[PDB]
Point group: C3
């Protein structure tokens, strides 16, 4: 009849994409390098009615982004402080005055005067010292040990991730959503909730809880090559302590170069440990097993201790008040299921190698006084052996972060599109995504404004500007350089779409339309450019 | 040659040294567009 | 003034930090620096002879 191509700019549609995200967060904490901005005191969440979106926590690039940022913050924070390479000397270690795990070692060091040396004493944990005038520090034959900067705590600070201009973060609100599949309730957010970068190896601590039941998430529940993340709907408290009244001694190595050594120990020598209530642990396991039997046939399920590898994988590690604990969890993962207080002994180490980076050890200075902390077990990391057997495990930090980022997806806004009409030449951002085209076309300014809204941030800003300009140049070429709705003189081809005006405008959404004519865009755009030159 | 103006116009937009080059390319693009806006025909390649 | 008693003396900062010598080819003669505005900004100057501040 009389239908013509009309160009719309600011159309609420999107496609999956990867990009650079920025932080939002709020002395000298290791995670507070101020490399990124403060938070929004009142961020908004927009419910998209009638939007179904496919989520996949195992293909979520936000995980890789977080992992990289965490490593960077850690490394930046450890740069401005003392190296312990001057301590790589032979130690003379004994046990003359400690017990009736800790060695009393003497050694020579430098002083601020290069021609002088003195003999000093320090206590070391056995795990940090290797025998060869008897002993050497564990990493002196492989790398340089850097001590933690003494004023920097490791206590996690929630970090929110926020979208750059041209992008949006979608959140899944389905209560029973597991790792993958369609989500029927999707909301758009400016930023993620704050995520605490808690580091742990077998149990997950201080994370989010499930809302109705225990949710078992896995990439492939039937494989043995994949880990299983179990999220609890109820926390279990774990009480950890370091009972020895350790003192701190400060040793001068050089010109403003200070080393912190364990001094003597006041009082009894006691072993570090963690306390878990027996009854809550058993209830937790009845429920973990109950939901595991929904993926597995009605088979006997057993749990065993981690099968092997080094201390980092076989034990549950965590940072409690600045000390690095390794705890024996064989007291938890030891049971058989068919159709009081638990005490976990622990060990303390000062020289650690985080994130499996071999050759980059750090020395944690001893902390003065007794240490106590209470944490929330909010989940578990389990693996399967080739009756089904489950063991705690997985030292790959990306799995901890997948437990918080599973609800989020990053998409790119694609504001330009076309539809036929009869002309011739407040919902919030993406709020109209579920509306029909005839309604959604009235909110175009909302999305158009959000196209403009370190090196990685400069690249993101420059690129967003370039994308904006490429779209404006294109519209200028076609005509209507100043308009969001532009009628042109290319007639509509019923072969692209034979839908009536009512079906297109009062029934279909823009997302559906985008799919419907997705393969004709390279024809229509050319026709517009060509008719313009006549 | 006046009939291929879109081909060249599109090629105006197409480490620190690369950021400087890209930022500058944008700035010179905008200066030409501002000038055309001042003269008139802000949206056209051929302006009488 | 640069030497402090402790084989009698030490340089004054050896127990606190590293002393870097001035690069020997670098002079310290002041060079006038002008401060200039970026696009979108302007610098205004006051010309009142008795203006104090
Ligand atoms: C899961 O989430 C849990 C809840 O958030 C976490 O548990 C919490 O963990 C934090 C961090 O370890 C604990 O916070 C510490 O608590 C210590 C206890 O102090 C007590 O007594 C104080 C007396 O004045 C009082 O003010 C405190 O309120 C408390 O009653 C604190 O000492 C410690 O302070 C640290 O930070 C201070 C910041 O200014 C700093 O000044 C302190 O300096 C002291 O220690 C240094 C050590 O060298 C000395 O040099 C100084 O001279 C000085 O003595 C110190 O650095 C901090 O507040 C928190 O209590 C704990 N909660 C519970 C319930 O125990 C879990 O840890 C999380 N889980 C995981 C795995 O992270
Ligand atoms: C390492 O320290 C031990 C500390 O016991 C030294 O062993 C002896 O310590 C007693 C302490 O009264 C001395 O009287 C002895 O003379 C020490 N033995 C010797 C052979 O001298 C031990 O010798 C030290 N080792 C080094 C390399 O210094
Ligand atoms: C640095 O020294 C350590 C300690 O001797 C070496 O670690 C040992 O390596 C052997 C290799 O088979 C293992 O069997 C031992 O169990 C390791 N010991 C410990 C305490 O882990 C390390 O390999 C040396 N590094 C280099 C580059 O030689
Ligand atoms: C769909 O998800 C939205 C959140 O995106 C839910 O809306 C929240 O509902 C709770 C109910 O107490 C309110 O307290 C929140 O303030 C609401 N948030 C927003 C952004 O409106 C909504 O209830 C969910 N609907 C279904 C069927 O699950
Ligand atoms: C551990 O879990 C407990 C219980 O879930 C948390 O304590 C309560 O959390 C709710 C959350 O809405 C608060 O409203 C209550 O006021 C909290 N209780 C108290 C006594 O304040 C506890 O905060 C969790 N701990 C951690 C570290 O997350
Ligand atoms: C998470 O929930 C999704 C949705 O039910 C599960 O995906 C289904 O898995 C079955 C397995 O045979 C397939 O036949 C369905 O076609 C899948 N649905 C979709 C939409 O793809 C997924 O397997 C669950 N994963 C876990 C660990 O529970
Ligand atoms: C999930 O894990 C199962 C079990 O390992 C995979 O099923 C196997 O797939 C291989 C591929 O050729 C077959 O040779 C095996 O015979 C299959 N085993 C069974 C029991 O069917 C399944 O393909 C995995 N799914 C995904 C998406 O990785
Ligand atoms: C971990 O420590 C907390 C307190 O920090 C313990 O909670 C107390 O437990 C006693 C037991 O009789 C109660 O009377 C107190 O009222 C509890 N206090 C609070 C604040 O709830 C907790 O029981 C300890 N956990 C373990 C496993 O011992
Ligand atoms: C955790 O503690 C348990 C014991 O409470 C350790 O298990 C013992 O390991 C020794 C090693 O020689 C065996 O001889 C014992 O027979 C084991 N005991 C049992 C009951 O099997 C376990 O190895 C410790 N695990 C870690 C990671 O330290
Ligand atoms: C899991 O629990 C069982 C039962 O408590 C432990 O069985 C013990 O095994 C040792 C092995 O030397 C025997 O001496 C004990 O007599 C057994 N206990 C009982 C009550 O008979 C089993 O060792 C535990 N597993 C781990 C790894 O600790
Ligand atoms: C560890 O022991 C020290 C000393 O026993 C305690 O700290 C104080 O040390 C001074 C040193 O002159 C004494 O005069 C104070 O009386 C000590 N305080 C107390 C309360 O006795 C230190 O508090 C102990 N740490 C812990 C956690 O008990
Ligand atoms: C999501 O879909 C529902 C219906 O499937 C939309 O509800 C209709 O909204 C129009 C608006 O004028 C009303 O006239 C209809 O009567 C409503 N239908 C029903 C059954 O109530 C809803 O508006 C859509 N959401 C969005 C954002 O457009
Ligand atoms: C520091 O230099 C002085 C220089 O005077 C040394 O003192 C004596 O200097 C005279 C000069 O003729 C010598 O003949 C003496 O032999 C020097 N004394 C000694 C004991 O040799 C002074 O000794 C020097 N100090 C050091 C540490 O070398
Ligand atoms: C480094 O050595 C200098 C010189 O001994 C120290 O400076 C003295 O500090 C005391 C502290 O009360 C003052 O009373 C003296 O007057 C200072 N002397 C001079 C020459 O200024 C300095 O404090 C030492 N630094 C450290 C870290 O110990
Ligand atoms: C420290 O140096 C002194 C210098 O005589 C030496 O006798 C002593 O044995 C050295 N100590 C150690 C533990 O090597
Ligand atoms: C320390 O050296 C002595 C010297 O003989 C030796 O007897 C002892 O076994 C050594 N200890 C270690 C841990 O090497
Ligand atoms: C956790 O899920 C189980 C599943 O039945 C439920 O019975 C229990 O009440 C839930 N816990 C909470 C705190 O809601
Ligand atoms: C946990 O449940 C099992 C079920 O057989 C039972 O044997 C065990 O004694 C229970 N443990 C506690 C702490 O109640
Ligand atoms: C539709 O496409 C065909 C392809 O041959 C073309 O001949 C026809 O003129 C087109 N109609 C419109 C309205 O563009
Ligand atoms: C230098 O050493 C000598 C040796 O006795 C001493 O008498 C003199 O007072 C010292 N001077 C200083 C500045 O220490």
């Amino acid at each position: 009849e009389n239908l013509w191509v009309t160009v719309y700019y600011g159309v609420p549609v999107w496609k999956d994409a990867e990009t650079t995200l920025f932080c939002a967060s709020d002395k000298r904490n290791v995670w507070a390098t101020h490399a990124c901005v403060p938070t929004d005191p009142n961020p908004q969440e927009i419910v998209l009615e009638n939007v179904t979106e496919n989520f996949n926590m195992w293909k979520n690039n936000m995980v890789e982004q977080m992992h990289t940022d965490i490593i960077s913050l850690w490394d930046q924070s450890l740069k401005p402080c003392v190296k312990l390479t001057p301590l790589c000397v032979t130690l003379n270690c004994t046990n003359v005055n400690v017990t009736n795990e800790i060695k009393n070692c003497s050694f020579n060091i430098t002083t601020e005067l290069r021609d002088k040396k003195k003999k000093v004493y320090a206590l070391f944990y056995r795990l940090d010292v290797v025998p060869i005038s008897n002993y050497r520090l564990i990493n002196c034959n492989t790398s340089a040990i850097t001590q933690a900067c003494p004023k920097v705590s490791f206590e996690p600070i929630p970090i929110h991730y926020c979208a750059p201009a041209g992008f949006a973060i979608l959140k899944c609100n389905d209560k029973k959503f597991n790792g993958t599949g369609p989500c029927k309730n999707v909301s758009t957010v400016q930023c993620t909730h704050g995520i605490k970068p808690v580091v742990s190896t077998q149990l997950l601590l201080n994370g989010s809880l499930a809302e109705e039941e225990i949710i078992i998430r896995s990439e492939n529940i039937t494989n043995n090559a994949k880990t299983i993340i179990v999220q609890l709907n109820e926390s279990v408290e774990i009480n950890c302590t370091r009972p020895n009244n350790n003192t701190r001694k400060s040793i001068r190595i050089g010109p403003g170069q200070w080393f912190y050594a364990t001094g003597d120990i006041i009082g009894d020598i006691r072993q570090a440990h963690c306390n878990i209530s027996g009854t809550k642990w058993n209830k937790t396991l009845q429920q973990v097993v109950k939901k595991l039997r929904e993926h597995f046939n009605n088979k006997t399920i057993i749990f065993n201790p981690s099968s092997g590898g080094d201390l980092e994988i076989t034990t549950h590690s965590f940072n409690c008040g600045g000390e690095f604990f390794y705890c024996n969890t064989s007291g938890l993962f030891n049971s058989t299921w068919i159709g009081d207080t638990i005490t976990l002994p622990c060990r303390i180490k000062q020289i650690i190698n985080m994130w499996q980076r071999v050759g980059q050890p750090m020395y944690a200075p001893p902390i003065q006084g007794k240490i106590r902390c209470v944490s929330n077990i909010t989940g578990l990391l389990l693996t399967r052996d080739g009756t089904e057997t489950f063991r705690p495990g997985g030292g790959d930090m990306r799995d901890n972060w997948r437990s918080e980022l599973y609800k989020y997806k990053v998409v790119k806004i694609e504001p330009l599109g076309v539809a036929p009409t009869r002309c011739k030449r407040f919902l919030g951002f993406l709020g109209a995504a579920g509306s029909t085209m005839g309604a959604a076309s009235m909110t175009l300014t909302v999305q158009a404004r959000n196209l403009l809204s370190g090196i990685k941030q400069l690249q993101a800003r420059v690129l967003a500007v370039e994308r904006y300009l490429r779209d404006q140049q294109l519209l200028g070429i076609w005509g209507c350089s100043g308009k969001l709705i532009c009628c042109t003189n290319v007639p509509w081809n019923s072969s692209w779409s034979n839908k009536s005006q009512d079906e297109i405008w009062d029934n279909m959404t823009w997302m559906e339309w985008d799919k419907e004519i997705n393969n004709y865009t390279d024809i229509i755009y050319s026709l517009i450019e060509e008719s313009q030159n006549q």
